[PDB]
């Protein structure tokens, strides 16, 4: 199944190098002029999106009215959300760096996470568009044996669950 997920528009916390999950921070300047260069870029087809603002925002700025489903939200860092990434305990940092075994106080784990973002991409009956998050989109490029770092507001389209399509960013 053709699907195309987009990581949102960065945000403050990018620059900043802090763990963002379900903080709900808005979009930067850059990161809104990000979602623009999507529109056009970006093929016709029914669209998905975390209901976080900085990925709705995107989607409207790339041109879309998604479908909102909480399913597509980054992974719920509890106790961990806005901590630098600097100073997270090494342990931590193997299990974020590894993708396996991270169980935040307070927040989601990240075989819950998979769990969660793999239910609803089976879901999909149809090509479709997905706004989504870093962490999501690290998830999916992960399972399919790849790198799963992308860039803000770039997208990479899939065949699911079989292998990646191509890697889109803008300048």
Do not use: C
């Amino acid at each position: 199944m053709e699907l195309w997920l987009v990581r949102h528009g960065e945000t403050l916390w990018n620059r900043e190098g802090r763990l963002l999950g379900w903080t709900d921070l808005p979009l930067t300047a850059e990161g809104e002029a990000q979602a623009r260069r999507l529109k056009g870029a970006l093929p016709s087809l029914p669209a998905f999106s975390s209901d976080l603002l900085r990925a709705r925002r995107t989607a409207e700025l790339a041109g879309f009215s998604p479908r909102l489903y909480p399913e597509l939200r980054e992974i719920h860092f509890g106790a961990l959300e806005g901590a630098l990434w600097e100073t997270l305990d090494p342990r931590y940092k193997e299990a974020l760096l590894r993708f396996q075994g991270f169980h935040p106080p307070g927040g989601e784990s990240l075989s819950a996470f998979q769990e969660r973002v793999f239910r609803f991409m089976e879901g999909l009956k149809a090509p479709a568009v997905l706004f989504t998050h870093g962490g999501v989109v690290r998830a999916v490029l992960r399972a399919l044996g790849e790198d799963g770092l992308v860039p803000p507001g770039s997208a990479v389209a899939v065949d699911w669950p079989r292998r990646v399509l191509v890697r889109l960013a803008l300048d």
